[PDB]
Amino acid sequence: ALMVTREDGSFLIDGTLPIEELREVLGAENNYHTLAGMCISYFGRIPHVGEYFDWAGWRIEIVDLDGARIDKLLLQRLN
Amino acid sequence: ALMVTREDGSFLIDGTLPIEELREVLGAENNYHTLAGMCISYFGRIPHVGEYFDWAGWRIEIVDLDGARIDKLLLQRLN
Ligand SMILES: [Mg+2]
Numbered sequence: 001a002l003m004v005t006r007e008d009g010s011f012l013i014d015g016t017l018p019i020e021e022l023r024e025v026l027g028a029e030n031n032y033h034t035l036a037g038m039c040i041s042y043f044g045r046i047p048h049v050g051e052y053f054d055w056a057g058w059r060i061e062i063v064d065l066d067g068a069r070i071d072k073l074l075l076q077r078l079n
Numbered sequence: 080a081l082m083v084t085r086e087d088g089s090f091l092i093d094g095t096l097p098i099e100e101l102r103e104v105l106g107a108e109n110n111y112h113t114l115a116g117m118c119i120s121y122f123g124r125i126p127h128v129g130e131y132f133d134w135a136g137w138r139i140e141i142v143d144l145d146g147a148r149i150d151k152l153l154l155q156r157l158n
């Protein structure tokens with residue numbers, strides 16, 4: 001499973017989810033095509049677990065880092 | 080890193096964290112000695128991501144499952 005819904009409606013998402021598929025899931029709106037690629041791109045480095053950024057009205061937080069691999073993300077809608 | 084603190088004070092924790100070390104971290108109070116072992120023990124099966132249970136005044140939620148391995152947990156204090 002690449003994506004699951006938590007009890008509060010927020011999403012746990014695999015770093016490999018393609019950005020195209022992500023956009024379609026979130027109903028939202030390079031040098032990347034997956035969610036993990038996008039995070040590396042934003043930070044310009046491999047982020048710590050618990051770091052986050054805001055993208056297309058959503059907060060993306062790193063929740064699991066396996067070696068250098070951004071394995072799992074938490075997505076929550078702002079507001 | 081086996082454990083990190085999120086912005087809201089909740090913990091992201093590796094399934095391998097020993098229960099003894101977990102108790103000491105949470106300030107809390109078999110057929111298991113790690114956090115992942117405890118989850119498998121509770122559910123009596125490999126749980127889905129997003130499943131959770133309450134233990135010693137804390138909520139434990141599965142956030143990343145890698146094959147059969149319970150890789151990452153979210154811990155939040157109740158109340
Ligand atoms: Mg991990």
Ligand SMILES: [Mg+2]
Pocket residue numbers: 014071072143144145150
């Ligand atoms: Mg995973």
Ligand SMILES: [Mn+2]
Pocket residue numbers: 064065066071072143144145150151
């Ligand atoms: Mn993982």
